Amino acid sequence: GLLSRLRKREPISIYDKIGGHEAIEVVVEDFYVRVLADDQLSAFFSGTNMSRLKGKQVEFFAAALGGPEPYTGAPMKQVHQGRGITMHHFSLVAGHLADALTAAGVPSETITEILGVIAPLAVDVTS
Amino acid sequence: GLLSRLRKREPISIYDKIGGHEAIEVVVEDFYVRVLADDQLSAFFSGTNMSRLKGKQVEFFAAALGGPEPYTGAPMKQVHQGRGITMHHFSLVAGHLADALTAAGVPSETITEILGVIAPLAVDVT
Ligand code: HEM
Ligand code: HEM
Numbered sequence A: 001g002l003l004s005r006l007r008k009r010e011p012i013s014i015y016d017k018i019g020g021h022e023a024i025e026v027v028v029e030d031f032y033v034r035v036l037a038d039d040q041l042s043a044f045f046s047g048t049n050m051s052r053l054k055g056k057q058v059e060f061f062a063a064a065l066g067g068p069e070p071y072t073g074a075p076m077k078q079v080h081q082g083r084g085i086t087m088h089h090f091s092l093v094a095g096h097l098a099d100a101l102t103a104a105g106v107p108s109e110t111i112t113e114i115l116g117v118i119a120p121l122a123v124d125v126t127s
Numbered sequence B: 001g002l003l004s005r006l007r008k009r010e011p012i013s014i015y016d017k018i019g020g021h022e023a024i025e026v027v028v029e030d031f032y033v034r035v036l037a038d039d040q041l042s043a044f045f046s047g048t049n050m051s052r053l054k055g056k057q058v059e060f061f062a063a064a065l066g067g068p069e070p071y072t073g074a075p076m077k078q079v080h081q082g083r084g085i086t087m088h089h090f091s092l093v094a095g096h097l098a099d100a101l102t103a104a105g106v107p108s109e110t111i112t113e114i115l116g117v118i119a120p121l122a123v124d125v126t
Helices: A002-007 A020-037 A050-064 A076-080 A087-103 A108-125 B002-007 B020-037 B050-064 B076-080 B087-103 B108-125
Strands: none
Touching: A020 A050, A020 A087, A076 A108, A087 A108, B020 B050, B020 B087, B076 B108, B087 B108
């Protein structure tokens, strides 16, 4: 945990500073509510088991932000390639993530830092 | 609340200034009384969950006014998109908000301050 990490003089991760696994679960749950309510995005997920997805996204996001949990999903490029996702869509999705983080009380400077980790993924994500 | 905030040496926000969460609840409730009575505005709210809306409006105004809790609703542009809302409509709405704050006893100068925070939102709402 964070306590063990500090005893080792390791710098505090994003994961840790926004409240760890519990914080990410809440964010991700709110994130997909948003994404699915956006008529510009919802159809991409028409064939999706959202429980399973949200489960994989919690793992992905935790690991991306420094958490110790394994990501058990498929690679980003493979999953998204072929889906006709443009930068327009990716940006919309990013906005809902920022919104969810905002809603959970994450400081805006930290949300910017998180967007900094996620933005480069668009390379793998967009058509 | 305000007492804890003052003990932290935080400056008095507009939110705290007007009575905080409980005051905004009352104003919002009255605000929507007036909005729904205006024939030029009513039809926009046909079939709306007014209950949820009011709750989300309390969160929004409170946050916009320097309150302590984040707004958890949808962003202004997205939620108002595709409704054809004009500056005319926004102005009516802002007028109804000023009327509700006046009815709540909020001094005119603070109502002015509040409108200064609200007016710039027209860019997203229209
Ligand atoms: C922006 C960063 C994004 C990340 C980090 C991300 C991450 C993921 C993850 C972890 C999965 C699960 C993969 C698996 O099943 O193993 C997934 C699947 C998926 N992603 Fe994303 N995603 C992103 C953006 C988007 C965008 C912008 C869209 C389209 C607008 C999108 C559409 C989907 C769909 C529809 C699935 C599930 C496909 C299916 O199983 O039906 N993703 N993504
Ligand atoms: C004073 C600036 C305004 C603000 C701050 C504001 C704020 C909000 C908020 C917080 C919501 C709820 C979003 C959510 O469900 O998450 C909302 C929804 C809505 N607003 Fe506004 N609004 C403003 C002006 C207007 C005006 C001018 C109109 C039309 C004349 C309007 C009509 C509506 C409608 C029709 C909805 C959707 C209700 C629903 O079906 O859920 N608003 N607005």
